Write a protein that binds this ligand. Structure first.
Ligand code: NA
Lengths: 30, 21
């Protein structure tokens, strides 16, 4: 489900799901 | 950054995993 254009909450939900308990960092600007 | 790579273009598992802690 990751091989598409993922924007906004959509992208964050993909990080959330794939990263699991590791967590992630979301830096839209850098 | 991830916007350019995953929003402006098609994302990949590889790219997303780059942002996992
Ligand atoms: Na891309």
């Amino acid at each position: 489900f990751v091989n598409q254009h993922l924007c906004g909450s959509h992208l964050v939900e993909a990080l959330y799901l794939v990263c699991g308990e590791r967590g992630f960092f979301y830096t839209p600007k850098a | 950054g991830i916007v350019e790579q995953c929003c402006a273009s098609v994302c990949s598992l590889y790219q997303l995993e780059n942002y996992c802690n």
